[PDB]
Design a protein around this ligand. Sequence first.
Ligand code: NAI
Ligand code: V8H
Ligand code: CL
Ligand code: CL
Ligand code: CL
Ligand code: CL
Ligand code: CL
Ligand code: CL
Ligand code: CL
Ligand code: MG
Ligand code: MG
Lengths: 679, 686
Amino acid sequence: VLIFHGKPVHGAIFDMDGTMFDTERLRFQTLQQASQELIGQEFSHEYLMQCLGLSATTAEKLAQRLYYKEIRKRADEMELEHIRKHGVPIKKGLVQVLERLRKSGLRMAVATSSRRAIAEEYLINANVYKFFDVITCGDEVEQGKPHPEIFLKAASQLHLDANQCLMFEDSENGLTSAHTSKGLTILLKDIKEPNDEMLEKAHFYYDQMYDFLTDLDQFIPVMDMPEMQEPFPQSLNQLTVGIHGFGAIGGGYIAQILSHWDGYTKPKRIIASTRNSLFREAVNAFGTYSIRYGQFSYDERIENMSIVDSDNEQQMLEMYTHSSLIALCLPEQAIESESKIIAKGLYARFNSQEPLTFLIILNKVGAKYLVMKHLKEALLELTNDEDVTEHILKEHYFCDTVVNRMVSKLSNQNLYRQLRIKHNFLEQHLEDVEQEIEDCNKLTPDQLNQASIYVDNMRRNFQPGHILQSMDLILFHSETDMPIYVEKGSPLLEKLRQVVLVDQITDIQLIKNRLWNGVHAMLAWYASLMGYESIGVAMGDHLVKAFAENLIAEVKQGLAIVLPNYAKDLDRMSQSFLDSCEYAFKDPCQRVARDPLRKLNHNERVMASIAVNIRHDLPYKNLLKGAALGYAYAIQFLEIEETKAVEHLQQQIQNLDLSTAQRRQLEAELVQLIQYLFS
Amino acid sequence: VLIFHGKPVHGAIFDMDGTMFDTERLRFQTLQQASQELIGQEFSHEYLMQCLGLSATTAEKLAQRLYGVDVPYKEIRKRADEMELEHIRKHGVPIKKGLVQVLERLRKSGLRMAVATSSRRAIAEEYLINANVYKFFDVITCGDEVEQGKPHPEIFLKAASQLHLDANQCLMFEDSENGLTSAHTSKGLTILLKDIKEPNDEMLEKAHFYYDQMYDFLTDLDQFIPVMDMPEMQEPFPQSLNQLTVGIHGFGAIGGGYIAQILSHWDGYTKPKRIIASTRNSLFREAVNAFGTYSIRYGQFSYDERIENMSIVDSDNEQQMLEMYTHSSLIALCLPEQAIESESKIIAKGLYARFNSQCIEPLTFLIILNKVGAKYLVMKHLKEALLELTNDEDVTEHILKEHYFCDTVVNRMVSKLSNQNLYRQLRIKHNFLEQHLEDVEQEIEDCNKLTPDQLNQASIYVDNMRRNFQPGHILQSMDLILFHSETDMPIYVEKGSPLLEKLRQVVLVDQITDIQLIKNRLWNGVHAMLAWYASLMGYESIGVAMGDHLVKAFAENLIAEVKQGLAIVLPNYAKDLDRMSQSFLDSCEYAFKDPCQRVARDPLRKLNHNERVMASIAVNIRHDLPYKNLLKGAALGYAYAIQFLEIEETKAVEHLQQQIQNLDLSTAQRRQLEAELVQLIQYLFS
Ligand SMILES: NC(=O)C1=CN([C@@H]2O[C@H](COP(=O)(O)OP(=O)(O)OC[C@H]3O[C@@H](n4cnc5c(N)ncnc54)[C@H](O)[C@@H]3O)[C@@H](O)[C@H]2O)C=CC1
Ligand SMILES: NC(=O)C1=CN([C@@H]2O[C@H](COP(=O)(O)OP(=O)(O)OC[C@H]3O[C@@H](O)[C@H](O)[C@@H]3O)[C@@H](O)[C@H]2O)C=CC1
Ligand SMILES: [Cl-]
Ligand SMILES: [Cl-]
Ligand SMILES: [Cl-]
Ligand SMILES: [Cl-]
Ligand SMILES: [Cl-]
Ligand SMILES: [Cl-]
Ligand SMILES: [Cl-]
Ligand SMILES: [Mg+2]
Ligand SMILES: [Mg+2]
């Protein structure tokens, strides 16, 4: 029992033509063309506007009163032929509404003046027939629209009174039929500006189907955080979403968040950009990819993916124009170059005629600031107009995020290895197939012969892709951490299941940077130099875990002074980190120790902690070792020249907010400890 | 924490060749096939059996002693390695029966698992990927990454430490002598698994546990891992496939729209690799084989459940039906009552073929039929068919006593889709395929990571993959709907078969009598009584009739009076009554398709003293409960008999009084029941 604007709703009855689909426009065009090639004289726009929401038999009465079977027969044939090519024109929001009303527990039906033969055809084609218990057509009804019989019979077969049921309609005739039934009427504008009589009759009015959805969703419960192996929604909405950077995070985390969505519907397509052409062509070839959750050996298939090239402009603009939500999953190095591609997409969005929710995924203190700064400079260079830029930057929701999940991208050699192995299975599967529907079961020889031609070329196309039932494409190794923490602002994020909304994101990002990402980087450098290629395996070493526990102590002692209000939560986050590290066997040290110099910056996870501890006379001995191991890793594994390492070290220590006495002591202690490791 | 024979287990380290994969017996075949080519004569089975455990040099010296000094052993051995990889890469690594079932059980028990193989890192990883078992293992330890290989404990000690565990916390699986020593010395719980050669007495002493095969360990492990709970609606099936095949003799409504789900869930750890299903419907057979999968619709939630790993066959085709009864570990007979006699022959031909085959494991036969003692009818006809075929009373009686013939009770109402509605679907889905195949008609950049040889070869793979798969991308969000079913999950089965013990959607009972008595009075009794009312009121189906507040109120008040009675007679099934009560009222709400005629057949028989109607009244009267709705139900039966079936009013009373006298009631209660009931019938005329 749903309470819609303080009304006890038990069921819902929808009109098909003009309300659910945009078919009234089509038959408007076909009746004109059909009439021209039969009788010659086209139908007047007055006749067609009067015939809106009227049974073919009832419309034939108005045809004779003013002045049809053969005309309408060809008009219907033209109409359904348009559906065979271009599909059903489904009004935006329909699928989203239907699922919410279904899961609310409402007893739903369709009340269309169309024939059963035609009514079903479209409901089957649109894939919404499943949402309805009964359907009342313009055949079984004795007196059709605008008489309330069709709406009364619909409610009667649902075993509910009309007053308990909602009633959707586009037409003037149908709204009378709905109102005379004495149900909770809803009017959706299609191809008729509502009259005063129509506006009064209706209990609720909305400009579009999507406008009702927004009003309905404040009475529909928001679904809770998904569990690990929880299925995605079956029914797809008409919204697109983007992932700028099909990498570890984008493909191996965000794709799950977007696939779960609100738990009612799922985006039609997910457009993800990558420079990795092997990854791009591999996913487009398979159609899907899977995220491997190693802990529970669970392979999570993600579908409705379309991987595009980052350099190809027409596909990058396609994303930013048609997408409802974009996720920026790029490293700091790419932010400046790609801000040019983002600016063009946002300007292309403005040039075209909904608000955008822009998620920024980046491990950096003030991650948004960097993006917005580079985006503003990029936009101004292209637009040459400060009036349009300040509008664009204010229009869309640019959201800060905190991602705790550890994800790993598959190496190109291991992806080639996978492709080589899985190709040999396909080759053998195509030998197994090697090389007529008889019996004649309640079907004409015409249909049975026509069925054979369908089943043959279907098998011919599908049979090679039967192996995909067992065969997956594994591209990402992820841990089982679900909740992404995002800044408040965007109404869209309120309804997303996997998104948790927080306030002081800046305070969390700072602790995240220092206590999580900082300890993760420093132990990864220590582990790499000891000769571990796995975070999970490395934490098995008593020294590696002892070092991490020693670092955590020194960082938390510092943060507790800088953020005394968060001092309570440090022990929980520190323990949560070690747990995620302990069994991260498929998470490599390489990925965690990327860009060491960038991470050894004065305003970053290593040096920032050291500085705080020096100012407040706290121990920084283990932090100082990790800094030295950071430069040790940079010179030994990456080979960046020792001369540059000192020039960087000195530059960063010069930028640290310390006294010259502390600066020179820090440099002297750190350079001494670096030379100690190499000797 | 997984407890195994009083020892807490946190990890599980596996040997690869001989323990997980049957690659030792493949090496036997390659060495023989390689010898046949080069030297002309095959190496004797006896020689190859003698070589198991010996080094490559010792085996070469032994070959030199038997087949001459100039025998090209290294040439044969290298040829045999090529034949092994060539076979493994296309046909797949031969996985030991029960491994995947074991791995899922250990993994879902939260064990950190590894592989301690003497093989090279490169080749070891390919085999584990080929077999699709790499996902189960946290880390691999290889022979080329240890200073001292087996029988030194270094490889097992290393594997354990990498999982953050002491050796004594881990199960260690092995086949070879050296490996068991390596495993034993490390201090881990050693599980010895026989591969080809019977283990020596020194090994059997050394090992903590010995099994003849992986499946004997799976049987032992099952005692320590729990049977999973009743599956919820919309709950996924297991991802991992076991090597078992199962059958559905009658791919109909109940077979394809219920049993398919039960067998798809299986035990919750794994599911059958192949579900064979027999039907005479050609359109259904070729359509499922075209998509390679079909889907079951649940209208109440608008959920489409996809049943994959299906394989439909013709019921008439003998070789296909024999292959079902030869290969299947469990078969579900989902036929009508009429088809029992006719299809008794093909069952007998099937079970006889299984007896003649060398198949070794017994069969679990689930009798899916809504009839009283339905098993008796199947066993009787099967007994006659076997004799007529074999003409041997010993073989006939042996087959019947060998297999498990389980009687069942099902509560899920299912509707098979029509051939017109299927053609409609096939026409509209084929349309979308053409709409998709005009888009497919409408490129590996400088990798700087791969070599240009394997960059060229990568393009050929992806191109070949895309060309074959891309036409079938539309199957992602396209389901072939063949069945419309209710949300009733639990199936009741006779306890006996060991294979049923771990099946999670199954409810085992010592005797089926109890749940059959509930099914009779609570479901079929109310269904019959509710149908009689609907018919007299002039409704096409019960689905339409529930719109009338009289019909729905009657149904809701009738299930209540029967439930109250059964709650006293069977207090142990209290939870089952309440579950089955609402399950009936939900299904009836929109029971449009199935008419009243079938349910209202033989009202004379259904109003017997020991039957679904009169039995409920007598129970309620004995325990002083309301029976006014049951009495109305009895009246509507005699009314339906006189009006529709054209029975005499004198014949109705002649039957009635006989049934009343047989009930265990007071002579006062008998006379009162008659006087009330005859009055209700006289009104229903007018
Ligand atoms: N992976 C993790 O566990 C976590 C990562 N993050 C953040 O996620 C962000 C995304 O990085 P990941 O996906 O982890 O790394 P990654 O290096 O695997 O990302 C690869 C993706 O970025 C694109 N890309 C890389 N460099 C590019 C460039 N110069 N120009 C254009 N596209 C480029 C690639 O085409 C591909 O789509 C990072 O900034 C990181 O701080 C957040 C927290 C944890
Ligand atoms: N469905 C429902 O309702 C039910 C049923 N049940 C049972 O089962 C059984 C079976 O069902 P079905 O419906 O599935 O059947 P069909 O008819 O549909 O099917 C059969 C098959 O087999 C052969 O014969 C052919 O071919 C086909 O396919 C019957 O007899 C009954 O009694 C029980 C419970 C419930
Ligand atoms: Cl390779
Ligand atoms: Cl390692
Ligand atoms: Cl660097
Ligand atoms: Cl198995
Ligand atoms: Cl049954
Ligand atoms: Cl019966
Ligand atoms: Cl009778
Ligand atoms: Mg209309
Ligand atoms: Mg071995």
